[PDB]
């Protein structure tokens, strides 16, 4: 009961659906010698119709690929270019206007290492 | 920016850096006319590593074109491809004959024509915002690529000695000696300039090509434009990271950075095992890849030459392993645990040998990304018995009475025999000093 309330919870926080099922809403359990079987069948559902969702259109698939991509540092010869532009800002003893060049920097090596999708890569904020 | 501009130079150079071109452009995803197919930058990123950025798709090779023959500049110009060329930053069109077919003609060449020859390697880094460094293709077979290139190896670290310096310099047929009889003083002469100008080298010997081009190719006979073919794919295997990504050695002054352990010790032994016919029937059922590379330690892929009974008696120190397209990247490490246990990795007796190990995901082109590729570009103390090879023949050449007053036709008119003895005799120490 609290994992199925939760998965409508995502539904209540997204605009594409405000519910899970759409066709478990033409059947009304109300079960007490058989409740076990409605509640479960009417949970794992909620989330076959959640499952399809983010690999589909939120893309999650894509989105779990990027974030493992950058930060293990996969995309290696974009990073060791953009890190020789970074160790000339490390010249300079910090300030607080450090991170608004770098990310002009990030899209100089962007373009020159030229990797898959340079709008997708646009998301990589530097802070300081 | 990584802006390399190659110079590939000589007779045998020019038509092994003309396939080194038709190489490129089937796995960067492109046609030669412009970005029409677009696994053009989702395959390959790094569309501009040998090549200008786009300004409007339009791409510009960054090589430069020099030669004593007109022929061997004129099989590129007059080619299928040619519009992918453009000759204005690369040479100025119609470059005349030679003298020719000696060292010392394209070696005062470079003296006079000093001006001009360093004026064409600036018509292409006009769009080279910060210069990485220079590869020289020069060939030390002719007297045309070894003349211009022994010339081009001091200039280049004198006006640029900030940039990176490093050779394939493919030596003359050492079989031979009744053909090329000139081989003793011309490829000497080129390593003197190369271990006081240079602090890596790639050599290549050209009787071990042969070793591994019918027992592989399994054709008839090597002829010569059979034996660019196994050239062109281990120039374009030897910078896979700086065209792909890799977590390990992803700048080629990265790749050479971890292959020297000390000046007068660079000459690299390169090995690429994957050229056999029947790769085919074993690419499809998977070869695991616990066992396709502990197949490049032991020679049986090796493109210079050494014995079988002296492999015991020099170690291996640094060795790099690059695999291309994906393998199961996660048995890799798995399978370099079996390198100690067999002992095909040597260690030096005084200290630890290294494997770097790099690897990369790769563009949509079928030999390359459902083949398994393993390119091993060694250092091995083994290396000097070329050298006891070539000094055994340059003094029993000079008691010939030949070419010491038959090479002074041209800008030799004192004696520098006895330094290049010296120079050779050094270097041969230096190696053999290091280990214990």
């Given at each position: 009961?609290?994992?199925?309330?939760?998965?409508?919870?995502?539904?209540?926080?997204?605009?594409?659906?405000?519910?899970?099922?759409?066709?478990?809403?033409?059947?009304?359990?109300?079960?007490?010698?058989?409740?076990?079987?409605?509640?479960?069948?009417?949970?794992?559902?909620?989330?076959?119709?959640?499952?399809?969702?983010?690999?589909?259109?939120?893309?999650?698939?894509?989105?779990?690929?990027?974030?493992?991509?950058?930060?293990?540092?996969?995309?290696?010869?974009?990073?060791?270019?953009?890190?020789?532009?970074?160790?000339?800002?490390?010249?300079?003893?910090?300030?607080?206007?450090?991170?608004?060049?770098?990310?002009?920097?990030?899209?100089?090596?962007?373009?020159?290492?030229?990797?898959?999708?340079?709008?997708?890569?646009?998301?990589?904020?530097?802070?300081? | 920016?990584?802006?390399?501009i190659?110079l590939?130079?000589?007779?045998?150079?020019?038509?092994?850096?003309?396939?080194?071109?038709?190489?490129?452009?089937?796995?960067?995803?492109?046609?030669?006319?412009?970005?029409?197919?677009?696994?053009?930058?989702?395959?390959?990123?790094?569309?501009?590593?040998?090549?200008?950025?786009?300004?409007?798709?339009?791409?510009?090779?960054?090589?430069v074109?020099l030669?004593?023959?007109?022929?061997?500049?004129?099989?590129?110009?007059?080619?299928?491809?040619?519009?992918?060329?453009?000759?204005?930053?690369?040479y100025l069109?119609?470059?005349?004959?030679?003298?020719?077919?000696?060292?010392?003609?394209?070696?005062?060449q470079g003296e006079k024509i000093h001006e001009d020859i360093f004026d064409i390697i600036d018509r292409e880094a006009?769009?080279?915002?910060?210069?990485?460094?220079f590869?020289?293709?020069?060939?030390?077979?002719?007297?045309?690529?070894?003349?211009l290139?022994?010339y081009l190896?001091e200039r280049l670290n004198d006006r640029y000695?900030?940039k990176?310096?490093?050779?394939?310099?493919?030596?003359?047929?050492?079989?031979?000696?009744?053909?090329?009889?000139?081989?003793?003083?011309?490829?000497?002469?080129?390593?003197?300039?190369?271990?006081?100008?240079?602090?890596?080298?790639?050599?290549?010997?050209?009787?071990?090509?042969?070793?591994?081009?019918?027992?592989?190719?399994?054709?008839?006979?090597?002829?010569?434009?059979?034996?660019?073919?196994?050239?062109?794919?281990?120039?374009?295997?030897?910078?896979?990271?700086?065209?792909?990504?890799?977590?390990?050695?992803?700048?080629?002054?990265?790749?050479?950075?971890?292959?020297?352990?000390?000046?007068?010790?660079?000459?690299?032994?390169?090995?690429?095992?994957?050229?056999?016919?029947?790769?085919?029937?074993?690419?499809?059922?998977?070869?695991?890849?616990?066992?396709?590379?502990?197949?490049?330690?032991?020679?049986?892929?090796?493109?210079?030459?050494?014995?079988?009974?002296?492999?015991?008696?020099?170690?291996?120190?640094?060795?790099?392993?690059?695999?291309?397209?994906?393998?199961?990247?996660?048995?890799?490490?798995?399978?370099?645990?079996?390198?100690?246990?067999?002992?095909?990795?040597?260690?030096?007796?005084?200290?630890?040998?290294?494997?770097?190990?790099?690897?990369?995901?790769?563009?949509?082109?079928?030999?390359?990304?459902?083949?398994?590729?393993?390119?091993?570009?060694?250092?091995?103390?083994?290396?000097?018995?070329?050298?006891?090879?070539?000094?055994?023949?340059?003094?029993?050449?000079?008691?010939?009475?030949?070419?010491?007053?038959?090479?002074?036709?041209?800008?030799?008119?004192?004696?520098?025999?006895?330094?290049?003895?010296?120079?050779?005799?050094?270097?041969?120490?230096?190696?053999?000093?290091?280990?214990?």
């Amino acid at each position: 009961i609290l994992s199925t309330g939760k998965y409508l919870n995502v539904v209540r926080e997204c605009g594409h659906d405000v519910t899970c099922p759409d066709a478990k809403e033409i059947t009304y359990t109300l079960k007490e010698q058989a409740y076990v079987e409605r509640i479960e069948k009417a949970y794992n559902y909620a989330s076959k119709v959640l499952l399809d969702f983010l690999m589909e259109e939120e893309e999650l698939v894509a989105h779990l690929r990027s974030i493992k991509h950058y930060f293990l540092m996969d995309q290696g010869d974009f990073f060791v270019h953009f890190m020789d532009l970074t160790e000339e800002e490390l010249k300079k003893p910090v300030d607080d206007i450090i991170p608004t060049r770098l990310e002009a920097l990030l899209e100089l090596a962007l373009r020159m290492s030229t990797a898959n999708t340079d709008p997708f890569k646009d998301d990589l904020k530097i802070e300081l | 920016p990584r802006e390399i501009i190659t110079l590939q130079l000589g007779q045998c150079g020019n038509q092994i850096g003309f396939e080194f071109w038709k190489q490129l452009c089937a796995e960067h995803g492109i046609s030669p006319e412009g970005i029409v197919e677009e696994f053009a930058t989702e395959g390959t990123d790094r569309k501009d590593v040998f090549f200008y950025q786009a300004d409007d798709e339009h791409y510009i090779p960054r090589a430069v074109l020099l030669d004593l023959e007109p022929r061997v500049i004129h099989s590129i110009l007059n080619s299928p491809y040619a519009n992918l060329y453009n000759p204005e930053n690369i040479y100025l069109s119609e470059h005349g004959g030679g003298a020719g077919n000696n060292w010392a003609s394209g070696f005062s060449q470079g003296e006079k024509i000093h001006e001009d020859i360093f004026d064409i390697i600036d018509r292409e880094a006009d769009g080279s915002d910060s210069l990485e460094g220079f590869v020289l293709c020069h060939s030390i077979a002719g007297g045309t690529g070894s003349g211009l290139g022994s010339y081009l190896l001091e200039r280049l670290n004198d006006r640029y000695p900030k940039k990176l310096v490093q050779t394939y310099s493919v030596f003359p047929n050492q079989d031979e000696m009744s053909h090329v009889v000139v081989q003793p003083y011309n490829s000497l002469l080129t390593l003197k300039r190369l271990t006081q100008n240079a602090d890596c080298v790639v050599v290549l010997d050209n009787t071990a090509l042969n070793r591994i081009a019918t027992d592989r190719l399994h054709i008839q006979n090597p002829s010569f434009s059979q034996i660019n073919q196994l050239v062109s794919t281990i120039m374009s295997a030897s910078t896979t990271t700086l065209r792909y990504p890799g977590y390990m050695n992803n700048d080629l002054i990265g790749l050479i950075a971890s292959l020297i352990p000390t000046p007068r010790l660079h000459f690299l032994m390169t090995g690429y095992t994957p050229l056999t016919t029947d790769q085919s029937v074993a690419s499809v059922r998977k070869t695991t890849v616990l066992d396709v590379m502990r197949r490049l330690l032991q020679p049986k892929n090796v493109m210079v030459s050494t014995g079988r009974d002296r492999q015991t008696n020099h170690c291996y120190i640094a060795i790099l392993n690059i695999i291309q397209g994906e393998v199961d990247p996660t048995q890799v490490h798995k399978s370099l645990q079996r390198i100690r246990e067999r002992k095909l990795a040597n260690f030096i007796p005084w200290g630890p040998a290294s494997i770097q190990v790099a690897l990369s995901r790769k563009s949509p082109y079928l030999p390359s990304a459902h083949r398994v590729s393993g390119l091993m570009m060694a250092n091995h103390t083994n290396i000097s018995s070329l050298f006891e090879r070539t000094c055994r023949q340059y003094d029993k050449l000079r008691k010939r009475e030949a070419f010491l007053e038959q090479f002074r036709k041209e800008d030799i008119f004192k004696d520098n025999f006895d330094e290049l003895d010296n120079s050779r005799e050094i270097v041969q120490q230096l190696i053999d000093e290091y280990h214990a």
